[PDB]
Structures are given as C-alpha cells and as structure tokens.
Amino acid sequence: NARRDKLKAQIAASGLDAMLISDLINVRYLSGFSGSNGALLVFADERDAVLATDGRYRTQAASQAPDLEVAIERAVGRYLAGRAGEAGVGKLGFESHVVTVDGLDALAGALEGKNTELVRASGTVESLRE
Amino acid sequence: SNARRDKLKAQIAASGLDAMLISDLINVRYLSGFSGSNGALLVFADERDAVLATDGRYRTQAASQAPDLEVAIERAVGRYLAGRAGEAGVGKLGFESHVVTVDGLDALAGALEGKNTELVRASGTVESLR
C-alpha cells in the first residue's frame, strides 16, 4: 500500500520502529477501514500492518481491508501495543492528540516487561497529506 | 451551592483531592448549566465557589446559563484553570483521565510547571455521582 509505505519512511525518519494509529481519520486513510472503532499498527521495516477492530466490524474489515491481518479484540489499541512489544519494537509511536491518559496507561500495561518505549508521534500521518 | 457540585465536592474530598478540573462538555453542562462547545469547570473540595472558563463566543451564554459562577474568558480553558488551581494553592488537582488526552495532560502539566500542585487521575468521577 503506497500510503503505508510513505508512512514507513516517516516512521523511520522520526526514529521509531513502529506506530500505533488511533485517530479514525488516519486509520481510514491508511487502511480503507471506516468502522467507528479501530486501530492500526504499522512497522518501519518490511513487516505488514495489523488492523484491530471489534466483532461488530468483522465482516466490514474483511471487505474494506482484505490486504491486512485483522485482529478482533475488545481493546484495540491495547491489543496492538501488546503485539508491538511481542514483535520487539523498541520505540512505538502513538497519537497523543487522541489517546486518553487512561488509554496510555493501558498501552503501557500491555508492554510491561518488554523493552518498548511509547513515544508521542501525533502529526506523523498528517505529514503525508497535501 | 449546587446539589450536583455538592455531591462532587464530597467525592473530591473522599478521593483525597483539593479540587478537580472538569474538561468533558457533558459533565460541565451537568454541573453548571453551561452548554457551549468549549468550556471547563474548576471545582474545589472546600467552600470556595466553582470557576467556569470559556472563550469569548460564550460570554453572553455563560452569564445567562450559569449566573451563579465566576466566568473567566480564555482561549485555552484547561491551561487557564490548571494555572488558577496552582495560584489557589491546590495540593492535588484531579482531572478526567478517561477523556483528557495525553496532549491535554501535557498542557495541564505545563500550566503547573514550577508549582507545587500534583495532577491526579480521577477517572469517571462525575459519572460516579449518578
């Protein structure tokens, strides 16, 4: 995907190994998925992106984003942060303009005992637009 | 005096806080009557009256909807009220960590830089009164 590939270049330029996208405008831009709950994990390297949504959107994610692995989970951001930690991501960008303080605590909890740092990265996806 | 703010004051004190910043618009409306699209409310545990902050669009609206309150007219309502809490000697200031973003918290902390006031998560507090 051309947009996700442009994002990878910016992720790498920002000194990150992956980015968690939580803003639904940005999720839609990068994946084509338009459900009201969703998050996307994009890696700096050649690994493919992972979309997470809840059960309401299983069919929709399959039709809108057939190129992506889709996880069906109650807490989509948290799930993806946990995936990032398990994938050995050193620095994981997140969107501080939309993630709540409670939400960040959950992301951090999913990374306990992993050497993954959560790094403010709002603006990274926006940098790709006109 | 407001019956709703009085319940909040009792809860603020029970949680060990000296005041709480309300950022959520639905909760601001519940506690003050003010229904404008930008606003925040500072509520003290002690006998001090609450302070509403809103931008200049809403000077007339706030005065009419919440006539019992001091209304501060400010561009950046969260920063303003956090600073105000700092100046009022507030030891522990609760904030709505279930809706305040990581960016939002950064702004509040910035407003309190060099002051003794601790920002304390107060997730779902107004909602716990109903």
Q: Around Cβ B100, how many Cβ atoms within 10 Å?
A: 24
Helix (H) or strand (E) holding A86: helix A76-86
The tokens of B6 are what?
């009085």
Q: Around Cβ B64, how many Cβ atoms within 10 Å?
A: 11
Could you tell me if A92 and A116 are in contact, meaning their C-beta atoms sit under 8 angstroms apart? yes
The residue whose two tokens read 């918290």 is: B105
Distance of CA B116 to the CA centre of its chain: 18
The domain B1-130 belongs to what CATH superfamily?
Creatinase/prolidase N-terminal domain (3.40.350.10)
- What CA–CA distance (Å, rounded) separates B115 from A115? 33
In sequence order, what are the beta bridge partners of A18?
A43, A92
- What CA–CA distance (Å, rounded) separates A28 from A51? 11
- What CA–CA distance (Å, rounded) separates B39 from B28? 7
Which residues of A sit within 8 Å Cβ distance of B? Answer: 94, 96-102, 104-105, 120, 122
The residue whose two tokens read 């779902």 is: B124
Give the DSSP per-residue string, chain B: --HHHHHHHHHHHHTT-SEEEE--HHHHHHHHS---SS-EEEEESSSPPPEEEE-GGGHHHHHHH-TTSEEEE-SSHHHHHHHHHHHTT-SEEEE-TTTSBHHHHHHHHHHTTTS-PEEEE-TTTGGGG-
Tell me which DSSP letter residue A90 carries: S
Q: Around Cβ B90, how many Cβ atoms within 10 Å?
A: 26
3-class DSSP state of A104: helix
Q: Around Cβ B127, how many Cβ atoms within 10 Å?
A: 13
The tokens of B33 are what?
């009557």
Query: What b-and-e string marks burial along A90-126, b requiring 16 or more CB atoms within 10 Å of the CB?
Result: ebbbbbbbbbbbebbebbeebbeebebebbbbbebbe
Size of interface A-B (CB pairs under 8 A): 36
Tell me which DSSP letter residue A51 carries: E
- What CA–CA distance (Å, rounded) separates A64 from B105? 35
Q: Around Cβ B24, how many Cβ atoms within 10 Å?
A: 17
Distance of CA B79 to the CA centre of its chain: 10
Q: Select from B100, B102, B103, B119 the residue whose CB has the most chain A CBs within 10 Å, as the one to mutate to test that interface.
A: B102
- What CA–CA distance (Å, rounded) separates A97 from A124? 11
Could you tell me if B105 and B95 are in contact, meaning their C-beta atoms sit under 8 angstroms apart? yes
Q: Domain coordinates of chain B in residue numbers?
A: 1-130
- What CA–CA distance (Å, rounded) separates B93 from A97? 22
Resolution of this entry, Å: 1.7
Provide the edge-to-edge strand list for the sheet that holds A18-21: A69-72, A50-53, A39-43, A18-21, A91-94, A117-120
| Spatial CA neighbour of A94 closest among A63, A123, A119, A69 | A119
The minimal CB distance from A97 to the residues B95, B103, B123 is found for: B103
Instruction: With CB atoms and an 8 Å threshold, state whether A97 touches B101.
Output: yes
Residues in B touching A104 (Cβ below 8 Å)? 102
- What CA–CA distance (Å, rounded) separates B16 from B24? 21
Q: Select from B98, B100, B101, B105 the residue whose CB has the most chain A CBs within 10 Å, as the one to mutate to test that interface.
A: B101
Experimental method used, please? X-ray
3-class DSSP state of A117: strand
Pairing of strands B118-121, B92-95: parallel
Instruction: With CB atoms and an 8 Å threshold, state whether A101 touches B102.
Output: yes
